[PDB]
C-alpha cells in the first residue's frame, strides 16, 4: 500500500478507503468523522480551484507574455464595470456554493432542477456530483479519482509557489522557470537569502505596497514579508 | 514514578498527576482544596492562553520592527494606534469590557453550574456551550476541527503541550517586561545585542539587574 | 573473556561483548536504555565513518595540495576550477536536498528495521541489511562481508574512534598554530622544545568572523585564547 513514508504506521483514523489516502495526518485533523467528511469536500473544492487557477495562469502567460498574472486584476479593462462584475460573480458563486453546501449537509436534497421537473441528478456521493457534471468518464472511476486528488495537491502547491515567486521576483511561472534554468546555482531561494545569528537578509518585495486602481490605493502587500528567510 | 519539579521530593496528595502538566509543584499548598484547585486550573489555562497570544503578537511585531516595515514596539503600539487612527481610547476600553464581560460572565456561570449554558437561552445554541471538562470548553465553536472529540491519547498529549507552552509564554511575558524595564528596548533588539556579543551583553552587564556589579 | 579498558574494573551488565569494540566502557551509564543504546550505536557509527573520511581527506588534500589551508578551504575563493567563486547558496541547496533524502532513508531504517531496503523506483533492487547501520548490497559491491564480520566491524569501530580523536586533534592544532597537521608535525620535528602545546596554546589564529560574499559568518576557537 502506498504511503507518504515507506515503512511507517499510518494513523488509526486512516484505513485507505477514501481516494488519495496515503496515511498522512500528523496533527490528526481527520480523526473525527464529521470533520473528515467536511474536509474531504474542502480538499476537493481546493483541488479543482487550484487546478483551474494554475491552468489559467499558464495559458495567460503563454498567450499574453506582456501581462503579469499578479497584475491581471489591475491592467484589464472591460465595458462591464468592476462593481457590476463583482455583483454578477457574487450572485452566481453564492447560488452554486449554497447548492453545494446544502448537498453536503443534506445529501440527495438539491439534485433536482428547479426550472424543469424532468431533469434530476442521479444518486451519487458527496463531493462527486456526476450526471450532467460528468458527461465523459474515460477510464476507471477510482483510478481517475486518485489522479484527480493527486493533480489537485500538486496544483495547490503550484499555486502557492506561483504566488511566492511572483512576490519575491516579480516574474511569472514561465519567466521564473527560464531565469532559474539560465543560472540555477544563483537563482534559487538559497542564493537570494540566508539567515545567521549575526545577520538576517531577505529578498526585497517586488510588489508595490499600494496600487492606484481608479484613485483608491488598494494595498497589495507581500504575504508575511517579515517572516521571509 | 512520574517526574516532579524537585527530584527526590514526594509529590503532594492534591497533585496526583491527573491534570495536564502535573509535576507536583505546590510548596505553599495554594491548591489543596478541590474547588480551589479547579478554579486555579481554569485560571492557569486562561493565563497561559493569553500569554501565548501576547508572546506571539510581541514576537511578530518585533520581527516586523527589526526589518524595515515600520512596525512599532509592543510598548508603544497602543499610542501609535490611538494617535494614528481616530480611535477614542475610553470607547475602545468600554467595547472591550463589554465583549469580555459577556464571554467571561458566561464562562464564570458555567464554572459555577457545569452545562448550564447549554440550556439554549442564548440564541438557541445548546451543544456549542455544553463544555467538556474544567478549563477545556469543547464544541463546534471553540474547537471546529474536532480535535477534542477523537484520539484520546493525542488529546492528552495536546493538553500537555498546551499547559507547557502556556507556562513558557507566561515566563516569556515576564521576561519581556523585565527586559523593557532594564534595557529599554524591544525583545528582539536585546536578542540582537546578545547575539552580537554574548560574553559582554547580558543581564550581568546591563548595570540594572545586578546593582553590585 | 575480552579485555576491559581498565585493569580491575567490572564491565556493565548491559555490555557483554555482543557489539564490536566493546571494552566495557560506560562511566555515564548512557547505555542503560536499550533504545538509547541502539541510537547511540548508530550515532557512533556515523561519527566514526565521517571522521575517517574527514581525516583521510585532510591528509590527502595536504599531500596533493600543500598550499591550500584545510581550515580556510571552505571559502569560495579557495575552491578549485571550475567551482571557484561559485554561489554558495546553490551549493548548500544541493547538499541539503541530497543529504536530507539519504538521512531520511537512514532514519526510517533505524525506526522501522528492514522497511526501506527496496528501491522505490526500480522494484527488485534491495539490500540485504543484516544489522542496523550495516546495509551492504549496493553499499558493499566488493562483497567483503561474506566472512569474519566480527573482527572486521571491530577494526572499523576502532579505526573510527582513532580518526575521531585525530580529526579533533587536527582542529585544535589548526586553531592554536594555524597550519595543517603535516605542516605542524614538520614544525614540531624542527624544534620539539620550541613548538609544542606549552607555547602554542593561548593563541587563537581563527579570526572573529568571515565575510563569505554577502553575509558574515561568526567564527570562534574551542577555548578562550588570544584572537
Ligand atoms: C494587558 C497588559 C498591558 C500592559 C502591560 C500594558 C503596558 C503599557 N501600555 Mg497598554 N498595556 C496593557 C494593555 C492595554 N493597553 C491598552 C492601550 C494602551 C494605550 C492607548 C497606550 C498604552 C500604553 C502603555 C504603556 C504605558 C503604561 C500604561 O498605560 O500601562 C497600563 C497597563 C498596566 C499598568 C499593566 C496592566 C496589567 C498588566 C505600557 C508599556 C501607552 C503607550 O504605549 O505609550 C507609549 C499608550 O498610549 N496602552 C489597551 C487597550 C485599551 C490594553 C488592554 O486592553
Ligand atoms: C480560476 C479560474 C480562472 C480565473 C479566475 C481567470 C481569470 C482571468 N483570466 Mg483566465 N483562463 C482560465 C481560468 C481562469 N481565468 C483557464 C482554465 C484558461 C485556459 C483555457 C484560461 C485562459 C485565459 C486566457 C487566454 C486569458 C485569460 C484571461 C483572464 C483575465 C481576464 C479575462 C476575463 O475574466 O474576462 C472575461 C472572459 C470572457 C468573457 C470569455 C468567456 C468566458 C467563458 C465563456 C467562461 C467559461 C466558463 C468555465 C468553463 C467554467 C469553469 C468554472 C471553473 C473554472 C471554476 C482574468 C483575470 C485573459 C488575460 O490574460 O487578461 C489579459 C486572457 O488572455 N484566461
Ligand atoms: C509546487 C512545486 C514547486 C516548484 C516546481 C517550484 C519551482 C521553483 N521555485 Mg518555488 N515554491 C514552492 C513550490 C515550488 N517551486 C512553494 C510551495 C513555495 C512556498 C514555500 C515556494 C516558494 C518559492 C520562492 C520564494 C522562490 C521559489 C523559486 C523557484 C524557482 C527557483 C529554484 C527553486 O526551486 O527555489 C526554491 C523552491 C522552494 C524552496 C520550494 C520548493 C518546494 C516544492 C513544494 C517541491 C515540490 C516537489 C515536487 C516533487 C517537484 C515538483 C515537480 C516538478 C518536477 C514538475 C523554481 C523554478 C525562486 C524563484 O522565484 O525563482 C527565481 C524563489 O525565490 N519558490
Ligand atoms: C489594509 C490593511 C493592512 C495593511 C496595510 C497591512 C500591512 C502589513 N501587514 Mg497585515 N493584516 C491585516 C491588515 C493589513 N496589513 C489584517 C486585517 C490582518 C488580520 C487577518 C493582518 C494580519 C497580518 C499578519 C499575521 C501579518 C501581517 C503583516 C503585515 C506586513 C507585511 C505585509 C503583509 O501584509 O503580509 C500579508 C499578511 C496577510 C494576513 C495578508 C492579508 C492582509 C490583506 C491586506 C487583507 C486584509 C483585508 C482586511 C479584511 C481589511 C505589512 C506592513 C506581517 C508582519 O507583521 O510582518 C512581520 C504578518 O505576519 N498582517
Ligand atoms: C490577545 C493578544 C494580542 C493583543 C492584545 C494584540 C494587540 C495588538 N496587535 Mg496583535 N497579534 C497577536 C495578538 C495580540 N495582539 C497574535 C497572536 C498575532 C499573530 C502572531 C498578532 C499579530 C499582529 C500583527 C501583524 C499586528 C498586530 C497589531 C496589534 C495592535 C493593533 C490593534 C489591533 O489588534 O488591530 C486591529 C484589530 C483587528 C483587525 C481585529 C478585528 C476584530 C474583528 C472585526 C471582530 C469580528 C495591538 C496593540 C498591529 C500593529 O502592530 O499595530 C500597528 C499589527 O499589524 N498584531
Ligand atoms: C522565557 C525565557 C527567556 C529567554 C529565552 C530569555 C532570553 C534573554 N534574556 Mg531574559 N528574562 C526572562 C526570561 C527569558 N529571557 C525572565 C523570566 C526574566 C525576569 C527575571 C528575564 C529578565 C531579563 C533581563 C533583565 C535581561 C534579560 C536579557 C535576555 C537576553 C540575553 C542576556 C541574558 O541571557 O540575560 C539573562 C536572562 C535571565 C537570567 C533569565 C533566565 C530565567 C528564565 C526562566 C530561564 C530561561 C532559560 C530557558 C529555560 C532556556 C532556553 C529555552 C530554550 C531555547 C531551550 C536573552 C535573549 C538581557 C537583555 O535584555 O539583553 C540585552 C537582560 O538584561 N532577561
Ligand atoms: C567527506 C569528506 C571530505 C570532504 C567534506 C571534502 C571536501 C573537500 N575536498 Mg576532499 N577528499 C576526501 C574527502 C573529503 N573532501 C578524500 C577521502 C580524499 C582522498 C580521495 C579527498 C581528496 C581531495 C583532493 C585531491 C582535493 C579535495 C578537495 C576538496 C575541497 C573542494 C571540493 C571539491 O572537491 O570539489 C567538488 C566535488 C565534486 C565535484 C565531486 C573540499 C572542501 C580539493 C581541494 O583541495 O580544494 C582546494 C582537492 O584538490 N579532496
Ligand atoms: C590546569 C589549570 C589552568 C587554568 C585554569 C588556566 C587558565 C588560563 N590560562 Mg593556562 N596553562 C596551564 C593551565 C591552566 N591555565 C598549563 C599547565 C599551561 C602550560 C602548558 C598553561 C599555559 C598557558 C598559556 C601559554 C596561556 C595560558 C593562558 C590562560 C588564561 C586564558 C584562557 C585560555 O584560553 O588560555 C589557554 C588555555 C589553556 C592553556 C588550557 C588549559 C587546560 C589545562 C592544561 C588543563 C589541565 C586562563 C585564565 C593565556 C594567558 O596567559 O592569558 C593571557 C596564555 O597565553 N595558559
Ligand atoms: C506555581 C506557584 C504555586 C506555589 O505554591 C507558589 C509560587 C511559587 C508563587 C507559584 C508560582 C507562580 C508563578 C510563577 C506565577 C507567574 C505567573 C505569570 C508569570 C503570569 C503571567 C501572565 C502573562 C500574561 C497573561 C501576559 C499576557 C500578555 C498580553 C496579553 C500582551 C498583550 C500585548 C501585546 C500582544 C502587544 C501590544 O503592543 C501590547 C499588549 C496589549 C500589552
Ligand atoms: C564514550 C563516552 C560515553 C561515556 O559514558 C562518557 C564519555 C567519556 C564522555 C564518552 C566519550 C565521548 C567521546 C570521547 C566523544 C568524542 C567524539 C569525537 C572525538 C567526535 C569527533 C568526530 C569528528 C568528525 C565527525 C569529523 C568529521 C570531519 C569532517 C566532516 C571534515 C570535513 C572537511 C574536510 C575533509 C577538510 C576540508 O578542508 C573541509 C571540511 C569540510 C571541514
Ligand atoms: C430582518 C430581521 C432578521 C432578524 C434580525 C435579527 C433578529 C435576531 C433573532 C434571532 C433568533 C434567535 C433565536 C432563534 C431561534 C430559537 O432557537 C427558536 N425560536 C426557539 O424555539
Amino acid at each position: 500500500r502506498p504511503l507518504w513514508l515507506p515503512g511507517s504506521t499510518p494513523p488509526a483514523h486512516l484505513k485507505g478507503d477514501l481516494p488519495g489516502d496515503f496515511g498522512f495526518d500528523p496533527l490528526g485533523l481527520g480523526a473525527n468523522a464529521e470533520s473528515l467528511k467536511w474536509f474531504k469536500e474542502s480538499e476537493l473544492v481546493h483541488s479543482r480551484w487550484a487546478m483551474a487557477a494554475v491552468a489559467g495562469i499558464l495559458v495567460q502567460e503563454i498567450v499574453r507574455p506582456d501581462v503579469f498574472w499578479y497584475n491581471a486584476g489591475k491592467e484589464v479593462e472591460s465595458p462591464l464595470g468592476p462593481l457590476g462584475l463583482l455583483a454578477v460573480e457574487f450572485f452566481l458563486m453564492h447560488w452554486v456554493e449554497v447548492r453545494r453546501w446544502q448537498d453536503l449537509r443534506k445529501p440527495g436534497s438539491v439534485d433536482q432542477d428547479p426550472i424543469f421537473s424532468q431533469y434530476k441528478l442521479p444518486p451519487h456521493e458527496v463531493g462527486y456530483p456526476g450526471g450532467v457534471f460528468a458527461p465523459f468518464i474515460p477510464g476507471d472511476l477510482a483510478e481517475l479519482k486518485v489522479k484527480e486528488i493527486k493533480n489537485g495537491r500538486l496544483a495547490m502547491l503550484a499555486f502557492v509557489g506561483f504566488v511566492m515567486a511572483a512576490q519575491v521576483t516579480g516574474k511569472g511561472p514561465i519567466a521564473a522557470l527560464q531565469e532559474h534554468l539560465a543560472d540555477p546555482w544563483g537563482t534559487t531561494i538559497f542564493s537570494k537569502a540566508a539567515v545567521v545569528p549575526g545577520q538576517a537578509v531577505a529578498p526585497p518585495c517586488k510588489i508595490p505596497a499600494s496600487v492606484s486602481y481608479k484613485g483608491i490605493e488598494i494595498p497589495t502587500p507581500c504575504f508575511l514579508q517579515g517572516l521571509w528567510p | 514514578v512520574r517526574p516532579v519539579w524537585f527530584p527526590g521530593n514526594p509529590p503532594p496528595a492534591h497533585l496526583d498527576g491527573s491534570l495536564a502538566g502535573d509535576y507536583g509543584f505546590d510548596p505553599l499548598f495554594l491548591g489543596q482544596e478541590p474547588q480551589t484547585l479547579k478554579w486555579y486550573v481554569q485560571a492557569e489555562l486562561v493565563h497561559g492562553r493569553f500569554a501565548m497570544l501576547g508572546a506571539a503578537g510581541i514576537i511578530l511585531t518585533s520581527i516586523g520592527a527589526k526589518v524595515g516595515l515600520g512596525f512599532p514596539e509592543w510598548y508603544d503600539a497602543g499610542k501609535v494606534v490611538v494617535e494614528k487612527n481616530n480611535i477614542d481610547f475610553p470607547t475602545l476600553m468600554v467595547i472591550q469590557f463589554y465583549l469580555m464581560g459577556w464571554a467571561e460572565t458566561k464562562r464564570w456561570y458555567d464554572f459555577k453550574n457545569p452545562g448550564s449554558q447549554a440550556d439554549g437561552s442564548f440564541l438557541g445554541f445548546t451543544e456549542e456551550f455544553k463544555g467538556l471538562e474544567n478549563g477545556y470548553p469543547g464544541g463546534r465553536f471553540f474547537d471546529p476541527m474536532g480535535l477534542s472529540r477523537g484520539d484520546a491519547a493525542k488529546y492528552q498529549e495536546y493538553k500537555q503541550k498546551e499547559v507547557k507552552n502556556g507556562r513558557l509564554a507566561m515566563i516569556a511575558c515576564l521576561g519581556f517586561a523585565a527586559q523593557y524595564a532594564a534595557t529599554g528596548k524591544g525583545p528582539l533588539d536585546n536578542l540582537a545585542d546578545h547575539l552580537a556579543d554574548p560574553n559582554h551583553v547580558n543581564f550581568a552587564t546591563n548595570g540594572v539587574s545586578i546593582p553590585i556589579a | 573473556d575480552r579485555k576491559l579498558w581498565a585493569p580491575g574494573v567490572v564491565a556493565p551488565e548491559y555490555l557483554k561483548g555482543d557489539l564490536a569494540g566493546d571494552y566495557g566502557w560506560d562511566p555515564l551509564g548512557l547505555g542503560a536504555d536499550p533504545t538509547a543504546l541502539k541510537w547511540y550505536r548508530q550515532s557512533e557509527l556515523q561519527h566514526a565513518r565521517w571522521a575517517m573520511l574527514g581525516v583521510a581527506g585532510v591528509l590527502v588534500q595536504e599531500i596533493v595540495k600543500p598550499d591550500v589551508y584545510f581550515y580556510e578551504a571552505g571559502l569560495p575563493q579557495n575552491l578549485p576550477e571550475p567551482f571557484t567563486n561559485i554561489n554558495m547558496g546553490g551549493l548548500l541547496a544541493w547538499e541539503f536536498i541530497l543529504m536530507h533524502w539519504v538521512e531520511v532513508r537512514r532514519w526510517q531504517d533505524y525506526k522501522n528495521f528492514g522497511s526501506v531496503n527496496e528501491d522505490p523506483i526500480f522494484k527488485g533492487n534491495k539490500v540485504p541489511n543484516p544489522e542496523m547501520g550495516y546495509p551492504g548490497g549496493i553499499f558493499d559491491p566488493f562483497g567483503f562481508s561474506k566472512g569474519n564480520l566480527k573482527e572486521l566491524q571491530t577494526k572499523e569501530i576502532k579505526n573510527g574512534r582513532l580518526a575521531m580523536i585525530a580529526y579533533m586533534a587536527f582542529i585544535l592544532q589548526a586553531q592554536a598554530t594555524g597550519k595543517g597537521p603535516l605542516a605542524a608535525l614538520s614544525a614540531h620535528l624542527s624544534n620539539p622544545f620550541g613548538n609544542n602545546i606549552l607555547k602554542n596554546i593561548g593563541t587563537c589564529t581563527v579570526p572573529h568572523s568571515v565575510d563569505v560574499q554577502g553575509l558574515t559568518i561568526p567564527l570562534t576557537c574551542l577555548w578562550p585564547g588570544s584572537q
Side-chain angles (χ1 to χ4, degrees):
Chain A
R1 207 259 299 271
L3 294 178
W4 81 286
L5 205 74
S8 69
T9 63
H13 59 272
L14 292 170
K15 289 107 166 174
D17 301 333
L18 321 174
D21 203 332
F22 304 118
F24 172 65
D25 204 8
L27 304 193
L29 308 178
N32 197 359
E34 297 295 316
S35 291
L36 178 75
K37 194 185 295 188
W38 167 267
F39 294 157
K40 190 168 73 76
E41 187 88 27
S42 194
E43 190 187 6
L44 268 163
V45 168
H46 270 106
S47 294
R48 285 140 167 164
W49 267 118
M51 285 185 275
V54 166
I57 289 163
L58 288 172
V59 176
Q60 271 172 58
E61 182 156 22
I62 291 293
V63 172
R64 301 275 285 273
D66 74 318
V67 163
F68 195 35
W69 73 273
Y70 211 96
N71 287 314
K74 176 201 81 187
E75 57 202 32
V76 169
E77 179 66 45
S78 159
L80 298 80
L83 281 163
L85 292 159
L86 185 73
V88 164
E89 181 192 331
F90 156 73
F91 278 137
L92 301 195
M93 283 313 295
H94 182 273
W95 168 268
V96 301
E97 293 302 88
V98 161
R99 299 285 291 188
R100 173 177 68 87
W101 175 58
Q102 193 89 334
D103 183 70
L104 190 156
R105 63 214 307 260
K106 299 142 191 294
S109 56
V110 294
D111 286 355
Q112 176 70 232
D113 188 0
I115 312 295
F116 319 95
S117 47
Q118 38 185 349
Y119 299 124
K120 191 201 180 60
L121 290 184
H124 57 92
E125 314 186 7
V126 183
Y128 298 106
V132 68
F133 291 90
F136 198 47
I137 315 164
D140 190 70
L141 196 65
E143 171 181 354
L144 276 165
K145 275 177 190 189
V146 170
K147 290 160 147 177
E148 175 210 42
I149 197 67
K150 286 174 85 179
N151 272 268
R153 280 153 180 170
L154 192 63
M156 283 187 265
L157 305 178
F159 183 77
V160 166
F162 281 7
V163 171
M164 270 311 118
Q167 280 194 346
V168 162
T169 66
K171 305 194 170 182
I174 296 90
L177 189 138
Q178 282 298 106
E179 189 182 15
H180 164 68
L181 200 62
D183 197 21
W185 290 71
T187 53
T188 65
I189 192 53
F190 276 33
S191 303
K192 296 162 161 53
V195 177
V196 286
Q199 203 172 7
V201 60
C205 167
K206 300 281 174 64
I207 306 303
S210 165
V211 170
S212 185
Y213 191 81
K214 304 191 173 64
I216 209 69
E217 305 276 339
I218 277 163
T220 57
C222 274
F223 191 62
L224 313 179
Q225 199 206 346
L227 292 158
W228 276 7
Chain B
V1 186
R2 63 165 204 279
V4 289
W5 82 281
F6 202 57
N9 265 21
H14 55 278
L15 299 175
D16 43 353
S18 44
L19 300 153
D22 202 330
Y23 299 98
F25 178 52
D26 201 2
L28 298 183
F29 294 79
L30 299 197
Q32 200 174 184
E33 296 175 290
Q35 298 323 291
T36 314
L37 180 51
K38 215 188 292 183
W39 176 260
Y40 285 166
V41 161
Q42 201 178 13
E44 187 199 17
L45 287 175
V46 170
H47 272 96
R49 285 154 188 168
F50 268 127
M52 277 186 271
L53 289 179
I58 284 159
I59 285 162
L60 198 72
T61 44
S62 286
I63 279 169
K66 277 293 287 182
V67 182
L69 271 297
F71 261 71
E73 294 295 328
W74 71 267
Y75 45 86
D76 306 319
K79 181 181 185 293
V80 166
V81 168
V82 163
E83 281 183 4
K84 178 156 65 176
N85 313 115
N86 210 15
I87 298 176
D88 191 70
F89 165 77
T91 301
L92 185 81
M93 270 275 279
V94 164
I95 295 165
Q96 166 198 353
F97 265 114
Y98 278 165
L99 301 167
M100 282 295 299
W102 190 273
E104 295 288 83
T105 311
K106 286 196 82 67
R107 162 175 93 90
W108 202 359
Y109 275 87
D110 183 276
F111 174 83
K112 296 163 170 275
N113 190 4
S116 50
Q117 312 298 291
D119 54 350
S121 52
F122 172 61
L123 313 177
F125 296 129
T126 51
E127 70 174 26
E128 294 95 346
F129 305 109
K130 189 186 173 305
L132 197 70
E133 299 157 12
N134 177 69
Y136 293 95
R140 273 164 67 255
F141 280 168
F142 302 111
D143 194 15
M145 268 178 172
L147 295 188
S148 69
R149 35 182 184 266
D151 203 4
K154 190 65 64 65
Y155 176 57
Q156 292 295 321
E157 165 183 341
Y158 286 162
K159 281 169 81 183
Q160 189 88 1
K161 288 159 163 193
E162 183 198 25
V163 57
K164 277 155 93 162
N165 278 277
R167 285 158 183 183
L168 184 63
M170 285 189 264
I171 293 292
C173 280
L174 184 62
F176 293 161
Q179 271 176 221
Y180 173 55
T183 64
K185 317 180 188 72
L188 285 189
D189 278 323
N190 301 148
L191 177 66
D193 271 334
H194 188 53
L195 283 162
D197 198 12
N199 300 348
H200 304 114
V201 190
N202 45 2
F203 90 101
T205 60
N206 60 356
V208 184
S209 295
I210 300 170
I212 58 173
Chain C
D1 211 337
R2 75 202 186 276
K3 304 202 157 170
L4 295 193
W5 70 276
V9 76
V10 186
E13 304 299 325
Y14 47 87
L15 296 183
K16 288 162 190 301
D18 291 325
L19 290 174
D22 181 47
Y23 285 82
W25 189 48
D26 202 356
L28 298 195
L30 297 160
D33 204 15
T35 315
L37 183 63
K38 297 166 74 172
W39 171 260
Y40 297 160
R41 191 51 170 196
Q42 293 299 302
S43 189
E44 188 197 12
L45 282 178
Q46 289 312 122
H47 281 96
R49 284 155 184 174
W50 281 123
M52 287 184 276
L53 267 182
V55 164
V58 164
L59 289 182
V60 172
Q61 181 263 351
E62 196 161 8
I63 286 157
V64 179
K65 322 284 279 188
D67 303 332
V68 184
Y69 195 18
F70 81 103
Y71 210 100
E72 304 175 10
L75 299 165
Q77 56 258 35
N78 275 115
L79 277 162
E81 306 276 344
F83 306 113
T84 184
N85 282 291
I86 195 166
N87 191 286
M88 304 285 279
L91 179 58
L92 190 85
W94 267 113
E95 176 163 344
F96 162 76
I97 287 295
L98 300 195
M99 284 305 288
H100 189 278
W101 164 264
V102 299
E103 286 298 278
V104 159
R105 295 282 298 184
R106 190 182 56 84
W107 178 73
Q108 192 46 56
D109 177 61
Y110 157 76
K111 298 289 283 160
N112 207 6
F113 193 50
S115 71
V116 285
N117 300 352
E118 200 172 22
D119 180 6
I121 291 166
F122 311 104
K123 300 306 153 62
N125 296 127
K126 318 166 57 58
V127 286
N129 208 10
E131 319 184 18
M132 202 162 278
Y134 301 96
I138 189 64
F139 302 102
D140 186 28
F142 279 149
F144 293 164
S145 295
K146 42 176 196 61
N148 202 344
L149 203 69
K150 189 64 165 294
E151 59 99 20
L152 275 170
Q153 277 163 335
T154 309
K155 290 173 163 162
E156 173 195 21
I157 199 74
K158 279 173 76 170
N159 266 283
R161 287 153 179 187
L162 182 50
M164 285 185 250
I165 301 299
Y167 199 78
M168 289 333 283
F170 293 168
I171 286 294
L172 285 177
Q173 275 166 202
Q175 280 190 352
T177 63
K179 40 174 62 173
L182 286 166
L185 166 69
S186 66
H188 163 72
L189 278 173
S190 284
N191 61 6
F193 305 94
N195 269 311
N196 44 11
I197 202 167
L198 313 187
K199 322 279 203 316
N200 292 134
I201 210 71
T203 67
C204 166
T205 75
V206 181
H208 292 109
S209 71
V210 59
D211 176 69
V212 187
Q213 305 185 6
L215 81 170
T216 48
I217 308 300
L219 315 172
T220 193
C221 275
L222 283 181
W223 74 99
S226 77
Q227 295 291 131

